Each structure stands twice: as C-alpha cells, then as structure tokens.
Design an enzyme around this catalytic site. Structure first.
Site, PDB file in Angstrom:
ATOM      1  CE  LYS A  94      -0.862  -0.698   4.855  1.00 43.06           C
ATOM      2  NZ  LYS A  94       0.128  -1.788   4.985  1.00 43.06           N
ATOM      3  CD  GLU A 127       3.819   3.544   7.322  1.00 44.34           C
ATOM      4  OE1 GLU A 127       3.139   3.099   8.267  1.00 44.34           O
ATOM      5  OE2 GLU A 127       4.531   2.819   6.603  1.00 44.34           O
ATOM      6  NE  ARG A 128       9.398   0.167   6.393  1.00 46.03           N
ATOM      7  CZ  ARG A 128       8.321  -0.208   5.723  1.00 46.03           C
ATOM      8  NH1 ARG A 128       7.694   0.648   4.951  1.00 46.03           N
ATOM      9  NH2 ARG A 128       7.863  -1.436   5.830  1.00 46.03           N
TER      10      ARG A 128
HETATM   11  N1  LIG Z   1       3.303  -3.078  -7.601  1.00 44.19           N
HETATM   12  C1  LIG Z   1       4.320  -3.785  -7.084  1.00 44.19           C
HETATM   13  N2  LIG Z   1       5.254  -4.354  -7.862  1.00 44.19           N
HETATM   14  C2  LIG Z   1       6.261  -5.071  -7.347  1.00 44.19           C
HETATM   15  N3  LIG Z   1       6.424  -5.276  -6.040  1.00 44.19           N
HETATM   16  C3  LIG Z   1       5.551  -4.763  -5.155  1.00 44.19           C
HETATM   17  C4  LIG Z   1       4.428  -3.975  -5.639  1.00 44.19           C
HETATM   18  N4  LIG Z   1       3.729  -3.596  -4.568  1.00 44.19           N
HETATM   19  C5  LIG Z   1       4.355  -4.094  -3.486  1.00 44.19           C
HETATM   20  N5  LIG Z   1       5.431  -4.788  -3.839  1.00 44.19           N
HETATM   21  C6  LIG Z   1       6.349  -5.462  -2.916  1.00 44.19           C
HETATM   22  O1  LIG Z   1       5.758  -5.482  -1.630  1.00 44.19           O
HETATM   23  C7  LIG Z   1       6.665  -4.945  -0.684  1.00 44.19           C
HETATM   24  C8  LIG Z   1       5.931  -4.202   0.405  1.00 44.19           C
HETATM   25  O2  LIG Z   1       5.257  -3.101  -0.167  1.00 44.19           O
HETATM   26  P1  LIG Z   1       5.100  -1.799   0.718  1.00 44.19           P
HETATM   27  O3  LIG Z   1       4.118  -0.891   0.071  1.00 44.19           O
HETATM   28  O4  LIG Z   1       6.463  -1.296   1.065  1.00 44.19           O
HETATM   29  O5  LIG Z   1       4.463  -2.481   2.013  1.00 44.19           O
HETATM   30  P2  LIG Z   1       3.331  -1.843   2.935  1.00 44.19           P
HETATM   31  O6  LIG Z   1       2.078  -2.308   2.287  1.00 44.19           O
HETATM   32  O7  LIG Z   1       3.579  -2.477   4.261  1.00 44.19           O
HETATM   33  O8  LIG Z   1       3.586  -0.371   2.928  1.00 44.19           O
HETATM   34  C9  LIG Z   1       7.535  -3.993  -1.451  1.00 44.19           C
HETATM   35  O9  LIG Z   1       8.829  -3.984  -0.878  1.00 44.19           O
HETATM   36  C10 LIG Z   1       7.566  -4.582  -2.826  1.00 44.19           C
HETATM   37  O10 LIG Z   1       8.697  -5.425  -2.935  1.00 44.19           O
HETATM   38 MG   LIG Z   2       4.049   1.377   4.522  1.00 46.94          MG
END
Ligand SMILES: Nc1ncnc2c1ncn2[C@@H]1O[C@H](COP(=O)(O)OP(=O)(O)O)[C@@H](O)[C@H]1O
Ligand SMILES: [Mg+2]
Ligand SMILES: Nc1ncnc2c1ncn2[C@@H]1O[C@H](COP(=O)(O)OP(=O)(O)OP(=O)(O)O)[C@@H](O)[C@H]1O
Ligand SMILES: [Mg+2]
Lengths: 177, 365, 277, 281, 210, 70, 52, 105
Positions: free
Chosen positions: B32, B58-59
């Site tokens: 997300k 968040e980070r």
């Molecule tokens: N559209 C995407 N394409 C490729 N990898 C994705 C995508 N969305 C998420 N990811 C993978 O999922 C991991 C977590 O997504 P992130 O948005 O950082 O997590 P959160 O939902 O906890 O914020 C990312 O590090 C990425 O590697």
């Molecule tokens: Mg996040």
C-alpha cells in the site's frame, strides 16, 4: 496397389507432423508381440509353439509336437514345419499332444492359423476341457433342438448350428479313449 | 466524477471519485505504500492543484525517499523557487512518541483545509497509515485511565476516527481528494480500527496477501474492493457490465477453488474449465507494472487508460482471447501487449541456442 | 466464526477418509481385474501376426472408437484419450475421408462432442457395470458393422503397470475392402496360407475381421478398465495428499483461533473485574 | 420470499458492502410510488435514521430522496460520525419518536435504523467512559435492553388506539458473515424476520444478495400479497430444491434429467429475483 | 505500544547524510515465528518497520537446503540497485530462473508429465538451488560468489548432475585463476575483457561430475 | 474405545478376561483403522473385510441394557 | 438444519432425549421402534457425507 | 523443581559430577507457576499463562548448564496442551530444549 505402406514406423513419422509435438506416439499392438509370421525360426525339430488362445483364457503357450485341429472339412493334424494354413474350425476336439499324454479340449469353433514360421494359433471362443461336459444334457437338448424347426432362417440357422454342435459333442463324448 | 489512476484493477472494479475519500487496506508488506506512490505519480501530476502528504507513523526512510524524489521531479522546489512547489509534507513518522503520531494527521488536515477553505481549490491529501493515528491514541488511552474497549482499543475509537475523518471532505468551496493507506493489524479485516474506517470511505481498495503471494501486483482483492462509483448511472453501463462480469467470473472461480485443490481440474465441467481458464486470465490481467516499482523490479511500468481497460477486460470476458496462454496476461499494460507478449513467448519457444562460437569474447577481439 | 472452521475441518477430514477409501477400492479392483486383462492379451497377437498393423491407410470410410470410463474420478485418463482421438484422427486426414467417431463409456460421450460433434454417431455406455464379456464386445462390433467402413480405429489405454498407461491405437481393416489390398507385394503375403474354409477366401476374411474387431474391442475395453482403476488409484492418492495438507493448514489456523479465543475472553474478564476493583 | 407486514420489525443483516442500505432505500422510495395510488389513510411515512455514517453519505441520500420525490414523506435523522457519542446513541430513539407520531395518530410509519451496530458502539463508548463495567467484547450488560426497548416500539396498534402502525428495519453489519456476534445475536432475537445478505451471493450476480435459505419472516403468509401468496409458495418450494442439488452437481459427478430440471428451473428463479438499484417494482 | 517499542528501536538504524558524517547502521532484527505464521502480531509489526525480510522455511531446512531462504517471500527493496554490480549483472537471471523453477514446481508437485522444456527448467532450478546452499561459519567473498553464480546461471555446470554441485563449485573456485577475483573485486563488475577471460577460464575446470 | 484409556491398565484386570481382552482391543484397533469404509460393501477387499466384519461383530457384543450389570 | 429442509416440527431426532425412553416405562414395542428409528436416522447421517 | 535443582547443583558444584535431573512434566511446573501467578492477582498473558512465563521457565532452565566443575543434564517430560506445539508453554519450553526423544506406541 499397396500405395499406403503403413505401420508403426510410418505412423510415427507422419504423426509427428499433424499432432502437437509434445505428445508421445500412441502405442500399437505390434509393440507387445515378439513373434511374427514371416520371422523365420521357432521350429527346433519336432515340437512347435501352439498358441491355444481364448477371449477369457490362455489355455496353452508351450511348444507341442502334434495338434489335431477340427477343421470344417474334417479333423486334420499339424506337425512341426506344416504348410501355412488359415483353417476355420467346426466344433470339435482340439487334441494337444506332448508324447503319450493327450489333453482333449472340446472347442466351440473359431479359426486356427498356421504361419510360415511354424507357430500355430488356435483361436476359439469357448474352449472347454471335455472333462467338464455332462453326457446327459446334450441329447436332452438335441431332442428339443430337433423340434423347433421354423421357417425363420435366422432361427433355423441357429438350429442348424445347435444340432451340429450338439451332434459333434455327442459323437466326441461316446468316443472317449 | 471518476478519477483515472491508470491502474487496471482500480479503474475497472472500484473506480475512484475525484472528490472522494479513498482507502488502501493492507497487511504489512502487501504494497500500500507502493500503491500510494504510484497513485502519487499517476494522479498528482495531471491533477493541477496542491498536494499534502501527511506521513503518519511510517518509516523515516520513506519520507526521505519521497522528499528526494519530489525534489528530483520538481514537485518540490528549493530556495527562491519554493513558491512554485506543489506539495507540502507533514511528517509524524514511527520514531515519534505516541502523542506526536496522534496529532500529525490533524496537522496535515489543517494544511489541506486551508487550501480547501481559503485558497478555495482542489487539494490532494495522501495519508500513509491513518491506522497509526488510531494506534497512537490506543497507546495514549491506556495511561489516561480509560476502561479498554474491544481488542485492546480506546472506548473512543469510532468517534476519534470519525472526528478526524469527517474533516477530510470536499465542501462547496473546495475539494480534497483523499487517499489513506489503512493498515490491518494481523491481516485481520475485522479488527476494530479497519472495520471502523471502512465506513468513512467512498472507495475501499483492499489488498490481500494471498493475491501478493501469487505474484500478482498490485495485490488488490477484486472481490473485496468496492466503490460508490460502480453504479451504471455514474460510469456508464459498458464499464459497469464489464466490471460485474469480471467479478462474477472471479467469484465463480473462488467457489470452484475448494474442488480444484482436492479433485483437481480433471473433475470439472467443461463450463467450469472455461470459467477457470478465463478467471485465471483475468486474474493475471488485473496485475500491472508500476512506474515506481521499476527501480526494483526492472520491468518498466505501464499507464493503462480506462477505455483500454474496459475494452481489454470485455474481450477476455467474451472469449476473444482464449487463444492466448495465461502468462501472456501477467504484468502487461493493455491488450495490445498481451498479444505482443504472446507472440514473443511463442517466438522464444524455439530460439534457445547459437551462442556457440562467433563471439566477441575470444582472446584477441 | 470459530465454528465455521471446526466444521470445515470436519468436511476436509471426511473427504480425506472418503478418498482414502476410494484409493483402496481402486487398488482392490485393479488387482482382481488384471487377472482378466493379461488373459485376453494373448488373442490380439495372432491377428497382428496374421494381418499386420496398418493405422495410416487411405480408407474411404472409417469408424474410430475411443473407449473411455463411465465413472469420473479417473483423473485425466478420458481427456488424454479425447486428445489422442483428434491427434490420431487428423493424421488420417489426407483426401477428405469420411470418419464416424464412437465412444465407449459415458465420459467420452461428453468429451468428443466438444471437438467432433457432426462426426459423432454412437455412445456405448454402462459397459463396466457388471463386467466386460466377449458377447458384449461382439454386440458392440455388430453395431459397428451395421455401417461398414473400410477401417476401424480403437483408442484406449494399454495397462502396462499401475504407473504407466501409454495409450494405444489398434487398427482393423475390412476384409478385402482394404486389407488384402494392403497385403499384395510382388504377389501377396496372404497367399502363403491354405484357406481351409467352407466357402471362398473373401468370406473367411469377412468372418476373420469381425472376429478381429470383437477381440480388439474386448481387449481394448478390458485394458481401458484396468488402466482406469489404476488411474483412479493414482488420482485418489493425490486427493488424500491434498485433503491432508489442507487439513494441516486448517488445523494450524484453528489452533490460532483457539488461542486467540482464550486470550480475548480472558482480557474481557480481566477488564470487567478491574473496572470494579 | 420474506414478506413484511405493517407493524413487523425486520432485520437487514449482512456483511460490509452488501446491499443493506439499498434494500432499505428501495423500501422508502417504493412508499412514494404507493402513496400516490392509495387513499390518504393507508399512506406510509418513512423515517431514515442514519447513525454513525458519513455526513456526505447522508447528503447523497437527501439528494436521492429529493430527485425521486420520497423526501415529501421522509424524515432523516442524521447522527453522523463526527457527532458526539450520546447523539448517535439517542438518534434511533429520536427517529422512533418522530415515527411514533404517525403510529399513534392512526397513520402508518416506516422507520429504518441504519446500523444499529453503530449505535451500540456509541453506547459502549459512553458506558465505558461512565465507568460502567464492560461485558462481552466490551459491551455493557444492558445492550440487549438498549435495542429491545427501541424495536418493541414498532407495533401495529389496535383499532381502539387508531389502527396505526410502525414498521422497523434495523440494519446490523456483521464482520465476516459472523452472525454469532454479540449485537448481531441480540437483534436477531428481537426482530420478527431477518433479511440476510451475503457477500458471496453479491458477486455471483445475485443482487439483492438475499440468502433465501437463511432469510425468515415470522409473520410469513399472514401479511403478504394474496396474488403472490399463491405464486411464491411454489417459488420457495423450488428454490429449496435448487440449493442441495447444486452442492452436488458442482463436483460434476452425474445428472438425472429431473435433478437436471430442478437446477435448471432454480436458475430461472434466481435470475428472476435479481433487480436493479433504485427501481422498486 | 509494542509497535512503538520496536519502531523506535529500528528507526535508529539509518544511513546518515554527508553533513552528519555519512555513517550508517544496518539492523538485522530476528523474529521467531510459530509454525510459519507470518500473520502474527509482532511479526507483522516488525515487517512493517523493516526494509525487507529474509524468510527461512522449515520445509526447505528439513530437506537440507541451508540457508532455507524462501525466495518467493524474501525481499530487500532498499538494498536493491545498491548491491555488487557484477552480482547484479548475474543475479537477475538467477532470480528469474528460480522464479520459473517455483512456477513449474507449483504446477507439478508430482513427477509424471514431463514437457522436456519443463524438465530443463527443473534441472536448471535444481542446479541453482544446490549452488546457493552453503555451509556454516564460512562466509564467501562477493567475487567468489559472483563467479560461482556466473558459472551456474550460464552453462558450465550442466555436466554435473544434481549431487556433485557442492564439489563442483568448490572445484570452480579452486581451479579458476585467482587474478580474475582481483579484477572483479577492483573493477566492481565483469568487464567484457573479464567476461572473455571468465568464459575462457570456466572451460579448463575439471568438474567432479564426469 | 480409541479415546478411553486406563493408566493402570491390565494389571488390574480380571485374569481370564485379560486372556481375551488383549486380543479384543487389538481387533477393535484394526477395525477402527478400517472403519467408516463399511459403506463400501460392493467394493470388497477380502482381507480388511474380515476384520471389518469381525469388528462389526464385536461392537455388537459390548452393548448392554441399562441397570442389568453382568 | 431440520428447518431448512422444510421438516416441521424441526425436532432433532437424535439430539432430543427424554427420561421416558426406558423400555420399562413406555413398553418395549415403543422403545425398540424409537431406538430403531434413531439408528436408521443415524447411519443415514453417516452415509450422508458420501451421498453428497 | 527448584529443590531438585538444588540437590543436583550440590553434586555439580561440590562433588564435581555429571548430574542427571529429571523434571517430570515440565508442563506441570509451568501450570503450577501459572496458578501462583494467578493467585497473586497478576494479569495473565497469552493464552492463559502467567505474564512471567518465559522468565519463570528460564529461571529453572538456566541453572541446568555445564559449569567448569561439572554439569547438569536435564531430561524433562513434555506435555503438549491441546496437541498444539504453538501453545506458549511448549513454545517457551522448546526454546530451551537441546534434544527430543519421542517415545512411540
Ligand atoms: N506493484 C508492485 N510491484 C512489485 N512489487 C511490489 C508492488 N507492490 C508491493 N510490492 C512489494 O511489496 C513490498 C511491500 O510493499 P510496501 O508498500 O512497502 O508495504 P506496505 O504495504 O507495508 O507499505 C515492497 O517492498 C515490494 O517489494
Ligand atoms: Mg508502509
Ligand atoms: N440491487 C443491487 N443491484 C446492483 N448493485 C447494488 C444493489 N444493491 C447495492 N448495490 C451496490 O452495492 C454497493 C453497496 O451497497 P450499499 O450502500 O447498500 O452497501 P451497504 O450494505 O449499505 O454497506 P455500507 O453500509 O458499508 O455502505 C452500492 O454501491 C451499490 O451500488
Ligand atoms: Mg450503508
């Protein structure tokens, strides 16, 4: 006149063009037979391979030296390097001999081939040992089989086969050795 | 009015409203933040207003990432060019104490509400993890002498969250298009903070971990993502009928999956085999490469227009593309690229050799 | 919602014992029907060492039979035969030859119509209900002789072992409609044999090819039944594997829900007691 | 299938985004279509109580009730999410009192309490902040009495009191189809019927997503249309036969030419009971 | 506040700017998981704090694939495009080939239907997952890992069957002329001259599978 | 019988009953392992069908009739 | 479950017990038909997971 | 269990031996400490256990070690509560265990 020389090998080659290539070649009935007709040999003197078969059994497959087959002209015999034959059998006693000992199978009819390589394939439907028939029910049934005589040549041909099989069974059961 | 995001699953199945509250629901690692960054990249450039990024809980590394990439793309300008900036950042990241993370969303709201009420124009408010507001008030509420509510939360979850969320609206004098990431605590969509914030949004895009584990990105659960815009009087009957047919095929496959896992696909009807094949194709076709994901995936991202989304998904529904395999649909933009990738995968089914000699890597080249 | 998971464990566990029963049932039926399969394997051999194996011959009219199963947990056996049906039925196509397709077994009736619907004429079914007998295969040969092609194709699965059933096409040509016409080379190979029939050779081959069709059809639907039972034994082997791994996942998730239930009810009780004291 | 009489309270229970409000908005808009055709005595005046919702969600309903014309007969009692927790606890009682005017003076009322599950969260907030000791999930002990005090005010009065009527539609939101919750099992125990909406039926195309096997009406055949009492007796008799045969025939074992009839007929009836959004028939 | 406990802990692992000295601090939090349940409370707390994950599975660890790294679930997005350039040139093919190995093991968990191109990706995946598994308390320098996965993502090891790969990579590290390790360390990536000498040097290597 | 145990066990059994219960519980363990497959009667196995038939015998042995202790 | 089949009164035959179900209270001709009806309805439920 | 530990620690630290300690049902040690934590009015942690479960278990298990004098080797019977290895009492015990010997019927 034979301009389509098929086989397992030709079907393998043409089937790699129209089917998808990942499909392995479908097997053929040739692939489970080591014995053919034109493949010379399998004779070895006096005893010859007698493939006495049945739809529901294999009654003999070892080599025997003389076979009495009940063809439609009459009883004939097969020694080792016999002439090639496709003999239709009437209902009679196929005698398998290995020497002095004889096993007498009374069969229902069905063909018996002798091939150029000396293999003989007796191929009948109901091939009973003559031990397991009773001598009572045959004339008991032939008395009725000599009665229902209709103009229906389907039923009359069935009656002809009935009286002929029953008569051969009677003449084979009174004439035991 | 619809907000085009260039995302296939978002524009097709739960389309966004241009003055709507949008929620991205996810479970720690489902994507997300990557979705909210792709929505920033797609939406916040065509949308000619001001942006507010309220980073709540968040980070700090991600705030530095967004700040430096906004200075690079000129959304944020430093020095004497500062007045030509388009975004303002408010940060209450996860190193802050609970009182700071409980009020920083109100600071970002205040910055957005000035532009809505006084400048009188459209704002984009992106809030990364509005759950951290609720979690911070839940950390605080233990020491205030309150009897705890359900799972462990404050008794005032609904009213604190509703008092914050009802300020984030479009009024008659200006607009705030809101995108909030919502965290779900243990992949638990029935936890009181996500279940309370579901009723505050116009479009709720729910991200699933099971979709992400199949490699499908964005990991949007298509049978759990809703909008108030999926209504034929709002988006047109063509879009609505394609979206409902896509959802019907996916729900039918979901009902078949319990049989398929045990008895295999050999026990299915031919009608069932057709819907399983079509549903696998429309599951892979909902995935999309992102422009913000290309720095770690390597695949360049695609912005898929809404008309192309509707036409492509209608074609995969009617059975126009049953000739194509499943993996031709995976991580492509639109239906031109499915046929391009399906020619290329088929083309590479032969070409695997002739790197034997004739090199540029012998000793005297 | 904690009782939906307990009844889902109930469903998966009863499915996993049902499929384990059906695996042992298929294994029991595979051994006491292999005692009838390799008995009938012998009689196919004299006709192939007499008439030979001519699959790709330019028939005017052809009746192709795909003998498949009746019950349906066989696991991709009948679909493999339905794909080899067209894979061997397109390799016949050289001059626009007529083809009749015929399916033995209920699960071939539903599957050939998706691919060849205008060339479908007959469905023989309920054949493995009691057993397979030669009079039955004779009647099926009779109704395949009612219309009288120049060639017959039988598609089935040759029961090699309980692991492999590599599928088989066996071919049967009408007596001198094409069969002796495929035998004449610098003379003929059929003319070595002394025909000891009552009537001419044209009638002994007429009887002999109906007997060859009956034998091939009997052996085909016997080998296909035994390969069906072994394919079902291998198909319900993966079903108990799947219903055990699904059961293990569901048991782990039930343990999580049990622990969370005890913790949440305890936190409710403690919060009730602490608001009084 | 689950018909509703005047004076009956009927629970619209379902999961998160099923058609719960859409069933209740269609009951209000339809009373506008009937009020133009009935005489003045048997007109139904609707009250929609919006508890804990967005303020723009209820602004979309005032806009819908205006451009249909149902706002001539509709009162909207709006205690949104930014209102105080005693204003959302008390708004179902305020709306019941505004609708009890029509019951007590011989007219007919229709009250819709949208999310009683959001009224009880507003009640739990005050009870936990007045330091009343918590019970199940955190709820006060008297949270059954909270809703049964309110839903028992929906009555069909005697003819001595005017013959007036008040029909309630409490809405309860479940979490994962879990009707075994605290507030869910209370209102199921209070109300006569139940309109259970399923999220898996919603996405199969069946909209209104009514679980016909779980939805009840305790008044039943007493207060339905006599023209459809003799037709919809057969309809639920066939749809009961549709349900168990489709559990078997999705495996794909065998079919029986009359088992084939009931899952082909029940598909004619399932598609018949589908409906569009804002067009009451 | 057990999220705040770990968030205010792990947020101090930073990379500072050049005005603050340019120092860094890399954190490896370790979280034990019960029966593979990644959806636990503290696990999903620390996953939403850290920049990636390294998932270590019991089903890969019991089979002897050690380190038992779940490649489909392990991720590191901040360290990507910040790794060793020669390893970045080699390892994208390795991630893709292990991806297709996971695909065809997700299709065929029982072996009876062999496409012979699916058998190729099965054999290459089994070669690579034997390549990546290593022993304890002996870390490898990055150039000896770059050359070892260069010799595997290309040909050079298909002679070796599935067992002798652990000795094959040791024979490759031993019999390759150790100047190319110095050039790969010093240059940062495989230059085309070094790619030429590396394709040359991986042909005079005596593989134990012969 | 599968869930009912006795940690004292057969040290406090009637001897003579210990002669026969020791094979009774083994026969009932084999029957419980092959149980719930007795709905497959037409699908017969001829080695487990004996222990299934005898287990159905023995479960009918241990039934009693309410305040007639033996 | 008995009510969704349309069997009304939806009395669970196995789960409904009484202390009047002894043969020395209501006779043996009542007791054995009640226990036989219960046994047939129980092994039907044991078959019902395989009919479905 | 601490009394058995003290008897074993005398043989380790004074006699200099390789002692064997047998804690018969370590789960009953856990359950007893959970009862005395519940009776002292402490809020129970996860599933129902004492909040100090890891330290009340580790206070016993960390005295079973090898010193420079001798050692204590502990053979502890482990009961798993609901056939659930992720229950916190066996999940806390299994962190301390160096071997399992499963006896099978
Ligand atoms: N559209 C995407 N394409 C490729 N990898 C994705 C995508 N969305 C998420 N990811 C993978 O999922 C991991 C977590 O997504 P992130 O948005 O950082 O997590 P959160 O939902 O906890 O914020 C990312 O590090 C990425 O590697
Ligand atoms: Mg996040
Ligand atoms: N009968 C119907 N046909 C087609 N679409 C429908 C129907 N009923 C509802 N919908 C759609 O479903 C969506 C959800 O409807 P609704 O607003 O009633 O949800 P709800 O159950 O009230 O949940 P919430 O209270 O969370 O909004 C709406 O956007 C509406 O467009
Ligand atoms: Mg609603």
């Amino acid at each position: 006149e034979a301009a389509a020389p098929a086989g397992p090998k030709e079907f393998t080659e043409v089937w790699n063009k129209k089917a998808p290539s990942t499909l392995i070649v479908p097997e053929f009935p040739s692939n489970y037979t080591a014995v053919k007709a034109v493949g010379e040999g399998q004779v070895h003197g006096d005893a010859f391979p007698v493939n006495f078969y049945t739809p529901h059994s294999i009654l003999s497959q070892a080599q025997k030296d003389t076979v009495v087959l009940p063809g439609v002209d009459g009883y004939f015999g097969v020694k080792a390097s016999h002439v090639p034959t496709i003999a239709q059998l009437k209902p009679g006693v196929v005698e398998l001999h290995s020497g002095a000992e004889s096993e007498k199978f009374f069969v229902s009819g069905g063909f018996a081939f002798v091939h150029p390589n000396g293999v003989t394939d007796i191929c009948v439907l109901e091939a009973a040992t003559l031990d397991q028939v009773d001598p009572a029910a045959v004339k008991s049934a032939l008395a009725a089989a000599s009665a229902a005589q209709p103009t229906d040549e389907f039923e009359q041909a069935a009656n002809r086969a009935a009286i002929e099989l029953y008569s051969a069974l009677e003449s084979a059961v009174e004439a035991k050795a | 009015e619809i907000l085009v995001t260039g995302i296939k699953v978002v524009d097709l199945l739960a389309p966004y409203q241009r003055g709507g509250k949008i929620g991205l629901f996810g479970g720690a690692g489902v994507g997300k933040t990557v979705l909210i960054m792709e929505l920033i990249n797609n939406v916040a450039k065509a949308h000619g207003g001001f942006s507010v990024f309220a980073g709540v809980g968040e980070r700090t590394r991600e705030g530095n990432d967004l700040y430096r990439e906004m200075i690079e793309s000129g959304v944020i300008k430093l020095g004497a060019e500062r007045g030509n900036s388009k975004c303002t950042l408010v940060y209450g990241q996860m190193n802050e104490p609970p009182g700071a993370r409980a009020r920083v969303a109100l600071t970002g709201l205040t910055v957005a509400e000035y532009f809505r009420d006084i400048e009188g124009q459209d704002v984009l408010l992106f809030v990364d993890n509005i759950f951290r507001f609720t979690q911070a008030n839940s950390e605080v509420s233990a020491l205030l002498g309150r009897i705890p509510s359900a799972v462990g939360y404050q008794p005032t979850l609904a009213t604190d969250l509703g008092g914050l969320q009802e300020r984030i609206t479009t009024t008659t004098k200006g607009s705030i298009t809101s995108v909030q990431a919502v965290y779900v605590p243990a992949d638990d969509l029935t936890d009181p903070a996500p279940a309370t914030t579901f009723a505050h949004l116009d479009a709720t895009t729910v991200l699933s971990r099971s979709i992400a584990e199949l490699g499908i990105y964005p990991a949007v659960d298509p049978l759990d993502s809703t909008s108030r815009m999926l209504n034929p009087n709002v988006i047109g009957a063509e879009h609505y009928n394609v979206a409902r047919g896509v959802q019907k095929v996916l729900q039918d496959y979901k009902n078949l999956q319990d049989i398929i896992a045990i008895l295999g696909m050999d026990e299915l009807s031919e009608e069932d085999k057709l819907t399983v094949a079509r549903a696998r194709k429309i599951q892979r076709f909902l995935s999309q490469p992102f422009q913000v994901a290309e720095v770690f995936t390597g695949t360049p991202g695609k912005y898929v227009d809404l008309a192309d989304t509707i036409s492509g998904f209608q074609g995969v529904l009617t059975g126009k593309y049953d000739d194509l395999p499943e993996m031709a649909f995976y991580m492509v933009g639109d239906i031109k690229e499915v046929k391009e990738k399906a020619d290329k995968m088929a083309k590479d089914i032969a070409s695997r050799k002739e790197a034997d000699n004739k090199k540029v890597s012998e000793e005297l080249k | 919602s904690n009782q939906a998971v307990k009844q889902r464990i109930r469903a998966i566990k009863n499915i996993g014992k049902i499929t384990k029963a059906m695996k042992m049932v298929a294994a029991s039926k595979m051994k006491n029907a292999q005692i009838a399969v390799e008995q009938s394997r012998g009689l196919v051999d004299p006709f192939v060492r007499l008439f030979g194996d001519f699959p790709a011959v330019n028939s005017n009219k052809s009746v192709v039979v795909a003998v498949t199963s009746d019950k349906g947990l066989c696991g991709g056996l009948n679909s493999n035969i339905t794909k080899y049906t067209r894979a061997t039925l397109a390799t016949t196509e050289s001059e626009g030859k007529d083809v009749v397709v015929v399916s033995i077994g209920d699960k071939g009736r539903s599957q050939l119509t998706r691919i060849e619907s205008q060339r479908y004429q007959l469905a023989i079914a309920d054949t493995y209900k009691v057993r397979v007998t030669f009079g039955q295969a004779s009647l099926i040969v009779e109704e395949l002789i009612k219309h009288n092609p120049q060639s017959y194709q039988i598609l089935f699965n040759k029961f090699r072992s309980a692991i492999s059933f590599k599928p088989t096409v066996a071919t049967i040509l009408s007596p001198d409609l094409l069969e002796k016409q495929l035998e004449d080379v610098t003379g003929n190979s059929l003319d070595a044999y002394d025909i000891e029939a009552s009537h001419e050779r044209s009638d002994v081959l007429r009887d002999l090819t109906e007997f060859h069709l009956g034998v091939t059809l009997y052996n085909a639907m016997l080998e296909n039944n035994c390969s069906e039972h072994a394919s079902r034994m291998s198909a319900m082997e993966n079903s108990t594997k799947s219903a055990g791994e699904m059961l293990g996942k569901l048991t782990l998730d039930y343990n999580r829900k049990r622990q969370a239930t005890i913790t949440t009810e305890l936190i409710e009780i403690i919060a009730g007691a602490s608001a009084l004291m | 299938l689950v018909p509703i009489g005047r004076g009956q309270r009927e629970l619209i229970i379902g999961d998160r985004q099923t058609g719960k409000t859409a069933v209740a908005i269609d009951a209000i808009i339809h009373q506008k279509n009937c009020n133009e055709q009935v005489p003045k005595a048997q007109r139904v005046y609707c009250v929609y109580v919006a508890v804990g919702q967005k303020r723009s969600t209820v602004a979309q309903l005032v806009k819908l009730f205006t451009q249909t014309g149902a706002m001539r007969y509709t009162i909207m009692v709006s205690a949104t999410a930014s209102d105080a927790a005693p204003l959302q606890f008390l708004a179902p009682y305020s709306g019941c009192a505004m609708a009890e005017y029509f019951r007590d003076t011989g007219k007919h009322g229709l009250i819709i309490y949208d999310d009683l599950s959001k009224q009880s969260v507003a009640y739990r907030q005050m009870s936990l902040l007045l330091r009343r000791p918590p019970g199940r999930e955190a709820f006060p002990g008297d949270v059954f009495y909270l809703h049964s005090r309110l839903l028992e005010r929906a009555a069909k009065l005697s003819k001595e009191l005017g013959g007036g009527s008040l029909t309630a539609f409490p809405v309860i939101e479940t979490q994962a189809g879990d009707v075994s919750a605290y507030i869910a099992t209370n209102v199921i125990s209070i109300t006569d019927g139940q309109i259970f909406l399923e999220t898996e039926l919603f996405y199969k195309g069946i909209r209104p997503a009514l679980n016909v096997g779980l939805s009840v009406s305790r008044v039943g055949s007493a207060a339905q249309f006599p023209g459809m009492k003799q037709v919809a007796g057969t309809l639920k008799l066939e749809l009961a036969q549709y349900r168990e045969v489709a559990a078997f025939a999705q495996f794909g074992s065998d079919l029986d030419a009359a088992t084939q009839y009931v899952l082909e007929r029940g598909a004619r009836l399932t598609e018949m009971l589908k409906q569009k959004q804002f067009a009451p028939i | 506040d057990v999220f705040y406990l770990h968030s205010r802990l792990l947020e101090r692992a930073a990379k500072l700017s050049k005005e603050l000295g340019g120092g860094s601090l890399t954190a490896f939090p370790v979280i034990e998981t019960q029966a593979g349940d990644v959806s636990a409370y503290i696990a999903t707390n620390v996953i939403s704090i850290t920049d990636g994950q390294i998932f270590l599975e019991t089903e890969l660890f019991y089979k002897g694939i050690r380190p038992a790294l779940n490649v489909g679930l392990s991720v590191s997005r901040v360290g990507s495009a910040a790794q060793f350039p020669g390893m970045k040139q080699v390892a994208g093919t390795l991630k893709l080939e292990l991806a297709q190995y996971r695909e065809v093991a997700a299709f065929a968990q029982f072996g009876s239907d062999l496409d012979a191109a699916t058998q190729y990706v099965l054999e290459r995946g089994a070669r690579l997952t034997e390549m990546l598994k290593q022993k304890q308390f002996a870390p490898i320098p990055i150039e000896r890992q770059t050359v070892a996965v260069y010799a595997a993502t290309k040909g050079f090891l298909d002679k070796v069957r599935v067992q002798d790969i652990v000795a094959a990579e040791e024979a490759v590290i031993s019999q390759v002329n150790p100047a190319v390790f110095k050039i790969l360390k010093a240059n940062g990536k495989i230059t085309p001259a070094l790619d030429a000498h590396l394709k040359a040097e991986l042909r005079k290597v005596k593989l134990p599978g012969a």
